[PDB]
Design an enzyme around this catalytic site. Structure first.
Site, PDB file in Angstrom:
ATOM      1  N   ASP A   1     -12.653   8.280  -7.798  1.00 40.50           N
ATOM      2  CA  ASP A   1     -13.862   8.957  -7.356  1.00 40.50           C
ATOM      3  C   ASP A   1     -13.678  10.299  -6.561  1.00 40.50           C
ATOM      4  OD1 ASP A   1     -12.989   8.034  -4.935  1.00 40.50           O
ATOM      5  OD2 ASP A   1     -14.951   7.017  -4.391  1.00 40.50           O
TER       6      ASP A   1
ATOM      7  N   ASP B   1      -6.509   8.043  -0.643  1.00 40.75           N
ATOM      8  CA  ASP B   1      -6.134   7.179   0.510  1.00 40.75           C
ATOM      9  C   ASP B   1      -4.751   7.733   1.395  1.00 40.75           C
ATOM     10  OD1 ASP B   1      -7.862   5.243  -0.467  1.00 40.75           O
ATOM     11  OD2 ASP B   1      -6.321   5.191  -2.217  1.00 40.75           O
TER      12      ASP B   1
ATOM     13  N   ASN C   1      -8.892   4.920   3.218  1.00 38.94           N
ATOM     14  CA  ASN C   1      -9.760   5.851   2.150  1.00 38.94           C
ATOM     15  C   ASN C   1     -10.474   6.833   2.901  1.00 38.94           C
ATOM     16  OD1 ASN C   1     -11.109   6.645   0.046  1.00 38.94           O
ATOM     17  ND2 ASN C   1     -11.540   4.479  -0.837  1.00 38.94           N
TER      18      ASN C   1
ATOM     19  N   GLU D   1       0.901  -1.170  -0.022  1.00 35.40           N
ATOM     20  CA  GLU D   1      -0.090   0.084  -0.064  1.00 35.40           C
ATOM     21  C   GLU D   1       0.762   1.261   0.111  1.00 35.40           C
ATOM     22  OE1 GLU D   1      -3.202   0.103  -0.601  1.00 35.40           O
ATOM     23  OE2 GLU D   1      -4.037  -1.704   0.041  1.00 35.40           O
TER      24      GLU D   1
ATOM     25  N   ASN E   1      -7.993   8.564  -5.597  1.00 34.43           N
ATOM     26  CA  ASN E   1      -8.800   7.516  -6.044  1.00 34.43           C
ATOM     27  C   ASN E   1      -9.472   8.209  -7.213  1.00 34.43           C
ATOM     28  OD1 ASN E   1      -9.416   6.522  -2.809  1.00 34.43           O
ATOM     29  ND2 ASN E   1      -8.006   5.505  -3.936  1.00 34.43           N
TER      30      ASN E   1
ATOM     31  N   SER F   1     -11.832  10.829  -3.699  1.00 36.30           N
ATOM     32  CA  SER F   1     -11.357  10.244  -2.396  1.00 36.30           C
ATOM     33  C   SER F   1     -10.034  10.232  -2.372  1.00 36.30           C
ATOM     34  CB  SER F   1     -12.200   9.315  -2.009  1.00 36.30           C
ATOM     35  OG  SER F   1     -11.785   7.954  -2.590  1.00 36.30           O
TER      36      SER F   1
END
Length: 129
Positions: free
Chosen positions: A48, A52, A59, A35, A46, A50
């Site tokens: 959309d 992380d 998220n 990650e 992301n 959002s």
């Protein structure tokens, strides 16, 4: 902060992440490796809109507030910036909630694709824990 592998293992274990919800320590270390490459300051946007955050790429769609994910939730009740600290407490505590949401560590797509079904104990081999 960029953790060493065994350094992160020890920190995760001290915070009680080891075997949490049945996921051995190596699972958590492997998740963090893929990650964030063990970097607490990691951030990624992301599709959309959002983002992380942190060593476990938590998220903002659901788990933290970053001020810029309209319509999102804040289920860990924290600013997303808390997840970037050199102290992993907030990331660990929030990860405990996430892994308890029903899908286990499948919540972390990188864990599913890079860690699940592999020799995850390799990630803690050699460490004095």
């Amino acid at each position: 902060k960029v953790f060493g592998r065994c350094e992160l293992a020890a920190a995760m274990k001290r915070h009680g992440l080891d075997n949490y919800r049945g996921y051995s320590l190596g699972n958590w270390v492997c998740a963090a490796k893929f990650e964030s490459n063990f970097n607490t300051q990691a951030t990624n946007r992301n599709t959309d809109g959002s983002t992380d955050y942190g060593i476990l790429q938590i998220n903002s769609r659901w788990w933290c507030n970053d001020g810029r994910t309209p319509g999102s939730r804040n289920l860990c009740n924290i600013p997303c910036s808390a997840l970037l600290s050199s102290d992993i407490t907030a990331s660990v505590n929030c990860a405990k909630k996430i892994v308890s949401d029903g899908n286990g560590m499948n919540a972390w797509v990188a864990w599913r694709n890079r860690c699940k079904g592999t020799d995850v104990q390799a990630w803690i081999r050699g460490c004095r824990l």
